Amino acid sequence: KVSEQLKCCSGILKEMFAKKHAAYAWPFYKPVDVEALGLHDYCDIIKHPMDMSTIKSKLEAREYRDAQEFGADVRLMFSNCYKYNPPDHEVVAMARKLQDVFEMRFAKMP
Numbered sequence: 001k002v003s004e005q006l007k008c009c010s011g012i013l014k015e016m017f018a019k020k021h022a023a024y025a026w027p028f029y030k031p032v033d034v035e036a037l038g039l040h041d042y043c044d045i046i047k048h049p050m051d052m053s054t055i056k057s058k059l060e061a062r063e064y065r066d067a068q069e070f071g072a073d074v075r076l077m078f079s080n081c082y083k084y085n086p087p088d089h090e091v092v093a094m095a096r097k098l099q100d101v102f103e104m105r106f107a108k109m110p
């Protein structure tokens with residue numbers, strides 16, 4: 001039950017990494033590099049950074065006890081982007097497009 005849930009979660013994350021979504025998913029592939037992006041206050045505003053590669057590692061290390069915990073990290077990733085950035089910036093529009101994909105697949109899980 002939990003194992004099939006987490007298998008479905010791996011499938012959702014794999015789709016989020018797929019080329020068909022790459023035009024808007026790519027900023028979320030890896031942890032935010034605050035030095036390269038010059039975001040001097042990012043760590044003060046965002047207490048719990050999250051990204052898709054971290055979620056992938058946590059799935060492989062069986063860190064999620066159920067699909068709810070997986071979904072919470074995905075939504076944390078998007079919420080961090082909404083919290084840090086102006087609402088009409090491009091990276092927020094990209095986050096919203098990727099979140100459309102996530103929310104649809106996540107809702108249709110068994």
Ligand SMILES: COC(=O)C[C@@H]1N=C(c2ccc(Cl)cc2)c2c(sc(C)c2C)-n2c(C)nnc21
Nearest residue numbers: 026027028032033037039080081084085090091
């Ligand atoms: C200069 O960076 C910023 O102003 C914020 C940064 N913007 C961006 C960003 C992403 C795409 C565009 Cl077109 C413009 C800015 C960003 C990431 S991660 C990453 C590799 C990038 C390039 N990001 C996330 C996730 N949340 N905020 C950002």
Ligand SMILES: COC(=O)C[C@@H]1N=C(c2ccc(Cl)cc2)c2c(sc(C)c2C)-n2c(C)nnc21
Nearest residue numbers: 036037038039040042084085086087089090091
């Ligand atoms: C001149 O800068 C602005 O108008 C706003 C600034 N835009 C941006 C910004 C980021 C990405 C793009 Cl494509 C356009 C503007 C910005 C940051 S931090 C940072 C290093 C940059 C380049 N930012 C954040 C976070 N919130 N607002 C901004």
